Each structure stands twice: as C-alpha cells, then as structure tokens.
Amino acid sequence: IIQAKRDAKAAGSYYVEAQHKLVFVVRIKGINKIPPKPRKVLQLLRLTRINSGTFVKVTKATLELLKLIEPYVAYGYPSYSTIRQLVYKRGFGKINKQRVPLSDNAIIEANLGKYGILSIDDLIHEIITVGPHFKQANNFLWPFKLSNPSGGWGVPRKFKHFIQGGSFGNREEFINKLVKSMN
Amino acid sequence: AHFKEYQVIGRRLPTESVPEPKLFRMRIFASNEVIAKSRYWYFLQKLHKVKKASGEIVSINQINEAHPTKVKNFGVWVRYDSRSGTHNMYKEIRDVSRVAAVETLYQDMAARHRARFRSIHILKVAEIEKTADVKRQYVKQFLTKDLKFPLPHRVQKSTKTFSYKRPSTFY
Amino acid sequence: VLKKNPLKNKQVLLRLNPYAKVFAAEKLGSKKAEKTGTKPAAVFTETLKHD
Amino acid sequence: DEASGEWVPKWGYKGANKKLDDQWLVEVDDKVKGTDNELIDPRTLNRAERKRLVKKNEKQQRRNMKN
Amino acid sequence: GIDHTSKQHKRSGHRTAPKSDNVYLKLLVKLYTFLARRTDAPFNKVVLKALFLSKINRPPVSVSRIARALKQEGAANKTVVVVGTVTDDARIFEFPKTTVAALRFTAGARAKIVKAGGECITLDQLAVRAPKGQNTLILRGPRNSRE
Amino acid sequence: KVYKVGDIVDIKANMPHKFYQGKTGVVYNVTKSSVGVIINKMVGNRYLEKRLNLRVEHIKHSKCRQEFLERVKANAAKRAEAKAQGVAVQLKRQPAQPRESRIVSTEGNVPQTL
RNA sequence: GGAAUACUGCCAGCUGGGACUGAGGACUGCGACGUAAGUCAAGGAUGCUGGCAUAAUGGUUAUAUGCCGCCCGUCUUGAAA
RNA sequence: AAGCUCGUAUCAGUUUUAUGAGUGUAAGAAGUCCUUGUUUGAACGUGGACAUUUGAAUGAAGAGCUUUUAGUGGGCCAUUUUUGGUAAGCAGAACUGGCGAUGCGGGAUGAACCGAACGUAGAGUUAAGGUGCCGGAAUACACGCUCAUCAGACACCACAAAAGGUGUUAG
RNA sequence: GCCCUGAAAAUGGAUGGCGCUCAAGCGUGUUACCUAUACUCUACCGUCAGGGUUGAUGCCCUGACGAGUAGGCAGG
Ligand SMILES: [Mg+2]
Ligand SMILES: [Mg+2]
Ligand SMILES: [Mg+2]
Ligand SMILES: [Mg+2]
Ligand SMILES: [Mg+2]
Ligand SMILES: [Mg+2]
Ligand SMILES: [Mg+2]
Ligand SMILES: [Mg+2]
Ligand SMILES: [Mg+2]
C-alpha cells in the first residue's frame, strides 16, 4: 500500500485505497431514555450495556444500522494492534451459552476448528481480514466489556458528534486511541 | 483546536458511459482529517450537486507552511451566515503561518461577532506581498521603521501565598 | 482459576503464541524498510501548492 | 363541508347526501359480517336504504291524503 | 445496568422430582435416574420422565390394549412396559402369553396374565432384565378419554 | 384487467381515509363495480384485519413478488446448469460490498480548485 | 543539494516508584529454560524478621467531631404545603 | 400455572433487496421440474425426483398448541405529524416516549431537566455537573469584549417598537 | 457584539451565600484535575442455567444475573 501510493504519485496519479471492511463499535450511552428503534438495533449489535464493544463487517446492510445508532455509539476502523490487544486481554468465547476466557488454544480449536481456526492468532486473522467465517468467529467472541477511558474522553460533553467536538459517531482511525484507552 | 490545512480532492463515482469524472480540489482548515472530509462534502454539496453517497474522496494531503518562521501579513476574506443572507468580511492578520492566522480569525469571530466554526466560511487567505497594500490601522501601526515600545506595569506571578516584600511593577 | 494477561505475563504469551519467541528474537517490531528514492510528479507538486 | 373549503347543496342536484355514492374508499362495517349482505357494495346498500326512506315518505303522504 | 433481551432467573421446570412421598417410588426414581444418566438410553430417559407424572397424567392401561399392542407384527415376543396401573378387561376373552412390567397390577389383570401363562414383574426387575430397554414396548393410556 | 380473489393489490387513488394511500392488501371480495381489500393495521401491539371496499380504478396489481418469482426461476436454472457442468454456484443474494482500491489518473483530468 | 527535528502511529523493546487484592488447598493441564538430571514468575502467596502476649488489637457503651437524615400510618396524581 | 409436540424449531418495535405511496407489501416443504389427466389460454393433478452451497444482513434458547386465573383500566407531562384557531392562551385527532410502582449523581432547593437505574464490599476509571472561599477539584494557559448611581453570571418566551443613546469595538 | 434606557409598588433578603471588575462576568480554544448505587477487575451472599458424581430433594465444577406498589410462588 505504501509503495502503491508512492508509485501513483510518481506517475502523476492518485492511489485510492480500498474501503475499510471492518468497524469496531462501542456503546457510549446508558440504558435510560433510548428510542425504541435505536434500542432494537443496539440489541441486534449485542451492545446491551455501556462500554460494550463488537466487531461489525462493513456492508450496506450494516452501515444503515450504524447510522441508526450513531448518537449512542462511538465506532471506527480498528487496527491490527488494537484487535490483538483486545482479543488477548478481553477475549472471551461463547461456549454452551457461557462466557469462557480464551486462555488456551484448545478452547478455540475445539469450538472453531471446523472452520479451520486453530489458535487465537487464527481467530485474530479471521477478524482483521474479514474471511469466509467471520460471522461464526465474531459471534463466538463474547461482546467486549471495556472500562471507561483511562485518560478520559477528551471532551467536556460526550453526546455530540465527533465532528462537532463530542464523542459519538464515526471517528475512523481515532477509535484505536479511544479503545486502547478503554482496554 | 490548533488548525491544520489540507487539500481534499474528490470526484463523482465512475459509471458506465461516463468514465473518468472531473476531480475537484478544496483547501480546508480543520483540526483533523475526519473534520476536513466532512467540510469538503458539505461545501461540495453546497456548490455542486454531488453527495457523499454518490462520490468518493480521491486524496487528502496536509499542506505545510512554506516559510513558517517568516512574519507575514494576511488578508482574510470570510463569509458568514445571517437570516437576511451571507455577508462578507475582510480582516488583516499579522502572523507567521496561514493556520495561525486562521485560528486567530476564528477566535476573533467567536469573541466579537459571536460566530462559530460551522457558520464561518473561509473564502480566501492571501499574503500581502507589499506593505503598501495593507489597509487596516491595527496592522499598519506595527510596520513602522525602527518600531520600539515598552511594557509598563509588569505583573509578576508568585508561587507562594505570602510575600515578604512589597512588589514592584518596573520593567 | 485466575485469568492472566498475555500482554503482561510472558509465560502465558509464549503458551498462546509460539511465534512470539521468533518475533522477539528477530526484533520484528523494529524492522527496517529498504530505502527507495521515488520522486513525486510535478503535477502532484503543482496541485499541492496551488491556491 | 368540513373536509373541503366549499359550500355544497345538502340535497338534490350535486347534493351532499350522495357523496358516499362517489366516495373512493368505504370501510366495510363489522356488523355486516355473518350476513348475506357481506359481499354487497356499501354504496349500493346506502342507495337502497335512501330509496326505501323516500318510498316510506311517499307512502306516508298518500296515507295522509287517504285520511 | 444492562438492557436485558430475555427474562432473568427463569426456571426451566421440566418436572425435576415427583410430588409423591412413596419411598419405593423414590427408590425406583433413584434407580432410573442412575440408568438415564449412565446408559445413554432413550428408553431410560422416557421411563424416568414418566415416573414423575401425576395420577391424572398416568391413566390406566388395559390388558385388552396390551393384547392389541402385541397383535402388531414383530411385537408378539416383546415386553410390554406401562408406567402406571395395568387394569383388567372382561370384554376380551383370548389373552396371549407375554411378560408385562408395570408399577401396579390389579388383581384381575394379574390373574389374567398369569392364567394366560406370562409373568407380571416390577420396573426394577425390568431394569435388571433389559438395562437399555431391549425388546420393550411402552404403552400409554388414553388422556382425552377421561373427562 | 380483472382482479381475482387473493390477488395482492396497491391502493392508489387517481378525500377521507387518506391513511389508506400507498397501502398494499389482499383481495377478499370482487363485485362488478367494487373490489374488497383486506388491510392489516397495527392497532396497539397486534395487527388487526380491516375490510375495505374500493372502486376498481383506485387500485392496481402489485408487483411485490415479481423479483421473488424471477429469482426462484433463475435459481432453479442456475442449479440445473451447475449440475450439468460441475462447479460451485453461489445462490444467495449479497449486500453491497465496500469497493476495492483504484488508481485515479489526472491525464486531462487535472483537479480544479473551487 | 544533503541532513535533522516536529507530528502521528507501531514494538510478542528495556527499566524505576506507588496503591488494593492473596480467592483456591495432595498430584493431574497448557507451557518455558536446559544435551541431560532437573528447574521455573507455567491451572489463585510464599519466605525471612521483630514487638506484644494484654485491654495492646478488637467488641460494647456514653459522648464529641465531619457530612448525610422532615413524622409515621392512611387517603387522594401529588403532597412541606 | 399445568400438560402435549418441535427445537438449524420458532422467529425479530432492525437493516438490505425488489416493488408501491410520498412509510405499506414480498423475500421458498403452506417450495420447484418433467410427464398433458379436470371444466389452443387462465385456474385444479395422477407417477418420478432434486438437501446439511434450501435460497439477503444482524441477533436469537427456547418456540407452537390445548386448558387453567389473581390485580386492574379514563391519568398528568413532553416530542413529532395533521385539521381549525384566539387579544393572548389554544381546541380536536394519530404515533412515540417520561412518570405513578424508583432509589442513586448533578441542576442551591423541587412530579415530569441533565446523567444513570439499585445484592454486600475493595481498588481503579468516568457520566452529567464543576475546580476563588463555603466545597472535593487550575486565583490554569490563551485570544478578544464589557464598567452598569443596585452590570452579569437565566430560563433564549415576554417586556421588544431590531425603538432610543455625543458609550465602546469590529465590519 | 457588549453596555445604558426599554415601568416599578408596598415587613428585611438574596446569580444558594460571601464576594468578584486585564473577573471569580461574556464568547471561544487547549489541557490538567474532582467524583455516582454507572463502567472495568477481584472476593463474598443468593437466584437461575449448564455439566459431573454407585448427608443423592446431597456433594463437586462452570457461567450469567440481583429495582419494584397491587399481586403471585417458595423457604423459614
Ligand atoms: Mg487520572
Ligand atoms: Mg463532562
Ligand atoms: Mg479502639
Ligand atoms: Mg440535611
Ligand atoms: Mg479545595
Ligand atoms: Mg412589567
Ligand atoms: Mg463557582
Ligand atoms: Mg471563559
Ligand atoms: Mg446487577
């Protein structure tokens, strides 16, 4: 990607990168006073409490859900380091409807080996590159229970858009800083 | 925040029988690239009939000040919103960078005109090459040959609650 | 009986990831890139500098 | 007429007593269910009822003339 | 707080234990609980579930009904299992020879089976004979026939 | 243009009951001059069935299952084709995907500042 | 023309100070370091040392100090009103 | 609350796609093909078969059906549409929230405001609101404006005529 | 834009008080800091669920939950 941008500039062109295929979404507001349709969309995205996060595959069917729940979440494009740290520290699997910590490759192999996933790094790979079994791997992952940001939210009022000096909405690449603070 | 200047070049999405659409470039003052892209789509929708869902961002690049350690006079032509319409304003700002001048302008608009970032439009920031074209007195008074001025009544900050001497304001 | 963070506990890190040993040995977190001398186009420079 | 902003005759030529005949949509009443009049047009039923009322008035007038 | 998608502390139920204080019925429940845990036999699961039912849900099964069940093809040598009372029927005059396992037999039903030439056994003897319910036929009495 | 019982129709006027505009229902009764339509209206928390009587010209046939029928025909054809010539065929619809990388050349398309 | 630095991001880089916690109770597992025997920070605290051995810690009780605390029941949306 | 069955069953206050109106409907066993049988076309079928690449996304451990029964039902407020208005208030419909049954943080104080819903505790981080003193927290940093013979620290409605002024600042 | 006038009664009182004038006022920006029964981790209680087990309505392992009037069910 770095070389493509350098070569396109050298040839008088502009290299347009591929759009992001993955977002990380964190619920930012509590459960009091939520409109029913955003409430339903939050339940469908498994954001049942404040500071719960999930990975979402970017399609037209999910971008509209994100647009619906924009005032109540902060989301963006996660990086490999963010995903690796999230899975290593707060990675829990859903086995027999139970929240089981991913402390050994045996659990991951036993529950996801039919899809070719043998280790926590295979799981991270399927998350970062949205593979054929992203739905199964992401639903195997229990929703991440994050803390409050360690250095604060950076704003005096959270419930404005990130463009307008608030917190909610698509902050794109800055979700990495926010989530590493909250992790 | 502390502003940066970007160039944002975008276009309509390519279609069959209309390939290679025109590229449009804007110079945007913003704190970050997310704000810069949002402002670009706002202005592109306001001027052309291009929507974010119908187009794409070809490129966004930060533009640095060419000579950040040279003092310059800037003429800033801005346009702000009112219920009667949009009104022009021309201000002159002496500073060492375009982003510094734009930040000074935004602070001055917030102080005086009670204006906000979403309502203020920057139409032009242009350096004045020759001092003879400067026509604001608060800028012209600093262009005097051999400019010297004192700073009477210096107030020194104290680190302690009680002082054992009466303070002096000499400088 | 107690969850241990691989990002802090080296033994748990090596248990989960056998390749962390190679990563640390080869210093792959500070890998140097090959130096290339590609130059941008004059049209790109003019577009960037244009008002 | 409240729904429009016009004054209309309440009977006769273009009268307001026959607007249900030309109404574009009529809800079928629940009370008509379980009867053989379920499949009949409510506009036609109202025309029949109006004609029956007219004939009842004519019969009452002829009764007054007989008496 | 959390926006719950389902109710909290919901009892599944599923009739864990019988309401009876019969010690022998409790012993049979214990035996078939062990069997349904350690045998992986659907017959043992069904019998354990049936042992938990109430009287109105355990209707009696007649010897005529048992004979009609044995009238099937390939079932003439099977063991009839009724988790409940086997009652007598005088409307049937020809009864086959068979082994019947039941909780209770009436005097008439027991006499009729023994006279035909078979045996009336208990559920624990059935568990000894067929630990996985081999060659068994579970009969249930009519529910809606009572009113 | 004849409406049979069970057809799915759209209510499209060419003044009262303006709520039943653009609604789609199932025909339950047809006469010489009028057509009956069943509308499920959300009353409280449960759909309730309401009977409507319309003039013929104020409704039209609904094309709300045309794509489904054509897709079923195409799916059967594609599965038969892949049975004839063995290859994996993807028979499910997919959402719009994010677009891939591309190179935009400024050959004659030099960006114009506005 | 040759550099540096800023900014942003990454490191399965190193290292110092502080706070709270020590659930569990033979072994079993997954690992790591060692040619090996073995060792280990790897499925939850051990080791060493001192003072006291009693009103000292602690409890009770009477009060003082900081902050919080409207009078219950009933009847009406609501009740200091 | 009791029984029967099913549990890749049943689905959903959601999106997508297709089709409408300016939010409704549809998205598979309550399918499909061949063979030409019922009164050359619509509509009803005799006989065979295609499965776990069985027909968009996301979520979902409980679902469907028969019975069985305690307490209760004309309330207030607010938002969003629509019709008609008044000196001004507003009056009538439809949907959706909040409250009664509910404590906690903040707004000095409080039915409908901001935050957040509650097992007993420890440590950490925060929300809303704040950091002169009462009072935990910068008499922080920075650019401007203002001097009021009872300024202002507010609800953004009214007083309000975008009126008056030889106040001041920027256009 | 800010400031003054732009109508006011009637016990003595209120930006909550003190007070504050390059503010401790007004607009804006950048940080640091304070602390909720909220969030994160841990222990403990109870409930529910899923497993294992030849004082067995016991024991063991694991996971998630905990507001409440009328009222219901359960154990004391
Ligand atoms: Mg801190
Ligand atoms: Mg805040
Ligand atoms: Mg003491
Ligand atoms: Mg008090
Ligand atoms: Mg203090
Ligand atoms: Mg007045
Ligand atoms: Mg204060
Ligand atoms: Mg300020
Ligand atoms: Mg709780």
From Swiss-Prot, chain A:
Signal peptide: none annotated. It is found in: Cytoplasm. The keyword Endoplasmic reticulum does not apply. The keyword Disulfide bond does not apply. Belongs to the universal ribosomal protein uL30 family. Component of the ribosome, a large ribonucleoprotein complex responsible for the synthesis of proteins in the cell. The small ribosomal subunit (SSU) binds messenger RNAs (mRNAs) and translates the encoded message by selecting cognate aminoacyl-transfer RNA (tRNA) molecules. The large subunit (LSU) contains the ribosomal catalytic site termed the peptidyl transferase center (PTC), which catalyzes the formation of peptide bonds, thereby polymerizing the amino acids delivered by tRNAs into a polypeptide chain. Present with 101000 molecules/cell in log phase SD medium. There are 2 genes for uL30 in yeast. Component of the large ribosomal subunit (LSU). Mature yeast ribosomes consist of a small (40S) and a large (60S) subunit. The 40S small subunit contains 1 molecule of ribosomal RNA (18S rRNA) and 33 different proteins (encoded by 57 genes). The large 60S subunit contains 3 rRNA molecules (25S, 5.8S and 5S rRNA) and 46 different proteins (encoded by 81 genes). This is Large ribosomal subunit protein uL30A. The lineage of its organism: Eukaryota, Fungi, Dikarya, Ascomycota, Saccharomycotina. The gene is RPL7A. The chain holds residues 62 to 244 of 244 of the full protein.
UniProtKB/Swiss-Prot annotation, chain C:
It is found in: Cytoplasm; Nucleus. Disulfide bonds: none annotated. N-terminally acetylated by acetyltransferase NatA. Changing F23A: Leads to an inefficient release from ACL4 with a delayed assembly into the 60S subunit. Belongs to the universal ribosomal protein uL4 family. There are 2 genes for uL4 in yeast. Component of the large ribosomal subunit (LSU). Mature yeast ribosomes consist of a small (40S) and a large (60S) subunit. The 40S small subunit contains 1 molecule of ribosomal RNA (18S rRNA) and 33 different proteins (encoded by 57 genes). The large 60S subunit contains 3 rRNA molecules (25S, 5.8S and 5S rRNA) and 46 different proteins (encoded by 81 genes). uL4 is associated with the polypeptide exit tunnel. uL4 interacts with its chaperone ACL4 and the nuclear import receptor KAP104. The eukaryote-specific C-terminal extension harbors a nuclear import signal and delivers the ACL4-uL4/RPL4 complex to the pre-ribosome, triggering uL4 release from ACL4 and incorporation into the 60S ribosomal subunit. This is Large ribosomal subunit protein uL4A. It comes from Saccharomyces cerevisiae (strain ATCC 204508 / S288c). The chain holds residues 312 to 362 of 362 of the full protein.
UniProtKB/Swiss-Prot annotation, chain E:
One of its GO terms (biological process) is cytoplasmic translation. One of its GO terms (cellular component) is cytosolic large ribosomal subunit. There is a cross-link at K115 (Glycyl lysine isopeptide (Lys-Gly) (interchain with G-Cter in ubiquitin)). GO terms for molecular function: RNA binding; structural constituent of ribosome. The keyword Ubl conjugation applies. Keywords: Cytoplasm, Isopeptide bond, Methylation, Ribonucleoprotein, Ribosomal protein, Ubl conjugation. Transmembrane segments: none annotated. The modification N6,N6,N6-trimethyllysine is found at K49. It is found in: Cytoplasm. Component of the ribosome, a large ribonucleoprotein complex responsible for the synthesis of proteins in the cell. The small ribosomal subunit (SSU) binds messenger RNAs (mRNAs) and translates the encoded message by selecting cognate aminoacyl-transfer RNA (tRNA) molecules. The large subunit (LSU) contains the ribosomal catalytic site termed the peptidyl transferase center (PTC), which catalyzes the formation of peptide bonds, thereby polymerizing the amino acids delivered by tRNAs into a polypeptide chain. There are 2 genes for eL18 in yeast. Belongs to the eukaryotic ribosomal protein eL18 family. Component of the large ribosomal subunit (LSU). Mature yeast ribosomes consist of a small (40S) and a large (60S) subunit. The 40S small subunit contains 1 molecule of ribosomal RNA (18S rRNA) and 33 different proteins (encoded by 57 genes). The large 60S subunit contains 3 rRNA molecules (25S, 5.8S and 5S rRNA) and 46 different proteins (encoded by 81 genes). eL18 interacts with NAP1. This is Large ribosomal subunit protein eL18A.
Swiss-Prot record, chain F:
Component of the large ribosomal subunit (LSU). Mature yeast ribosomes consist of a small (40S) and a large (60S) subunit. The 40S small subunit contains 1 molecule of ribosomal RNA (18S rRNA) and 33 different proteins (encoded by 57 genes). The large 60S subunit contains 3 rRNA molecules (25S, 5.8S and 5S rRNA) and 46 different proteins (encoded by 81 genes). The gene is RPL21A. Component of the ribosome, a large ribonucleoprotein complex responsible for the synthesis of proteins in the cell. The small ribosomal subunit (SSU) binds messenger RNAs (mRNAs) and translates the encoded message by selecting cognate aminoacyl-transfer RNA (tRNA) molecules. The large subunit (LSU) contains the ribosomal catalytic site termed the peptidyl transferase center (PTC), which catalyzes the formation of peptide bonds, thereby polymerizing the amino acids delivered by tRNAs into a polypeptide chain. One of its GO terms (biological process) is cytoplasmic translation. GO terms for molecular function: structural constituent of ribosome. Keywords: Cytoplasm, Isopeptide bond, Ribonucleoprotein, Ribosomal protein, Ubl conjugation. Disulfide bonds: none annotated. This is Large ribosomal subunit protein eL21A.
